[PDB]
């Protein structure tokens, strides 16, 4: 009925990465190649994503055990969680007033209808609102969300993961610190990690209908040439 | 293969 | 003593060419990732750069004969020139007043100092810019300055070049037009044919030492991952 | 092989 010492000191490192790596003001967007509204948001939106990925591998590289990984695994991890991660941490400006996600004025406010204009259609970003709208109404605490994005990264069952009992035993004491939180520190909240549980199912079909319509535009030169050296190598088949 | 990701990984 | 009717179609096509891929507003500049003043201006000078290639293919495009080459040969062409042709075209926004690239207000005002912080040491921008006043004191007609860039692009001695003869064959009837245009078209410029090719000597010895200082870029992903995809394909060493 | 330089030279 009372968190462990290992479990809090879990949530403590989880919850400081990510105030190392999420800027709540969004300040740094001024330095991504200006959105104009062909595909006339691509260059902005990979700018954005760019950055993102740089941050989710900062977070990442302070989850307990994650550095202790092969750099393979490692890349493994990253390269196909990467796209659910930012989903993930995209919710913490989304927003149900607007249906859009709010990073600052008129300018970094980004519509569905601006994602369309990056090379997107609606058959992924119609579950992909869907999903930040039901994502948003969990009303997560900060240390449910910050768990929940570590969970998704540490998943075994992703193509190219070699040590998946290594991976593996750190998500179950990853879930494991997760349901007994819930349980204890969110009044009324038994229901909630089921909810979350699924909505990692979520990101899965997400992630696929993402990266297929990613191959599409990554085979016509002149939209990936549009994109950033760290997209190309991160969303596309290596070793 | 993977530079970049190698790099950021330190 | 009067240009071939055919010279002067050369000199209109390629003068034309010029008009088309080449902004005096430089009004595109403000699409860039901006500029910063750690390498705090390369993703602005990456862009200025990658902008920069993709203008020269538009104008190398329309120079007569340079279609009908194989496709093998107009990339080994532009993959070793495309820095001499744009330190060419550079110099309509070089000024003597400030001995910088004036492209804007403050923003896109080139100093020797900004790039600096791209990464670029004063071994290649102390020539470079001694080059661009030298080059402006020129005061070449628009007619000569763009004979000059199809000349350096169509040279037969470069590395890859498969087709020596054609090629050459081609930068022979271009240096022919400039000679003739000078002699006929520009009163006292009877040493100036001289001069233009003792600057495309100057440019080898500057491609020379930009590809030493970009292989020493290339080689640290930290800032390798700051290029585009174009800037990388185009100053890498493949087929 | 130049991958981006193939489609820009139409
Ligand atoms: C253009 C897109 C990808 C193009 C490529 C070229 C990669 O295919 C579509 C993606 C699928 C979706 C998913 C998240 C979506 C968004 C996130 C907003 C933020 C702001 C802040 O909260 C930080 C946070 O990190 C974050 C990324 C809104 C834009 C579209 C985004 C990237
Ligand atoms: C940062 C640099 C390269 C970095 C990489 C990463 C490529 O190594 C240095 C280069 C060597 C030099 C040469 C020309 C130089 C300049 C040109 C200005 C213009 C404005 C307009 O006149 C259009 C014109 O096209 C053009 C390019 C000024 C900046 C430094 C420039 C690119």
């Given at each position: 009925h009372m968190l462990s010492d290992?479990?809090?000191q879990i949530i403590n490192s989880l919850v400081e990465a990510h105030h190392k790596t999420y800027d709540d003001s969004y300040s740094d967007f001024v330095r991504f190649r200006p959105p104009v509204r062909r595909?006339?948001?691509?260059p902005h939106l990979a700018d954005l994503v760019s950055y993102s990925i740089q941050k989710v591998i900062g977070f990442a590289k302070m989850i307990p055990?994650?550095?202790?990984?092969?750099?393979?695994?490692?890349?493994?991890?990253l390269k196909?969680?990467?796209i659910?991660?930012?989903?993930?941490?995209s919710n913490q400006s989304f927003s149900l007033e607007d249906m859009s996600w709010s990073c600052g004025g008129p300018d970094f406010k980004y519509c569905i209808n601006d994602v369309t204009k990056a090379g997107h259609t609606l058959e992924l970003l119609e579950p992909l609102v869907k999903f930040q709208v039901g994502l948003k109404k969990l009303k997560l605490h900060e240390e449910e969300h910050v768990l929940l994005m570590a969970i998704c990264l540490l998943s075994p069952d992703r193509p190219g993961v070699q040590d998946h009992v290594r991976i593996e035993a750190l998500q179950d004491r990853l879930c494991?610190?997760?349901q007994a939180y819930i349980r204890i520190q969110h009044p009324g909240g038994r229901l909630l990690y089921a909810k979350m549980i699924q909505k990692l199912a979520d990101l899965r079909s997400l992630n696929?209908?993402?990266s297929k319509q990613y191959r599409s535009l990554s085979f016509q030169p002149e939209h990936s040439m549009q994109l950033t050296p760290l997209v190309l190598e991160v969303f596309g088949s290596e070793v | 293969k993977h530079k970049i990701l190698?790099?950021?990984?330190?």
């Open positions: 290992e479990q809090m595909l006339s948001m691509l055990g994650f550095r202790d990984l092969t750099a393979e695994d490692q890349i493994a991890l196909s969680s990467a659910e991660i930012i989903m993930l941490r494991d610190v997760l696929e209908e993402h | 190698h790099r950021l990984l330190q």
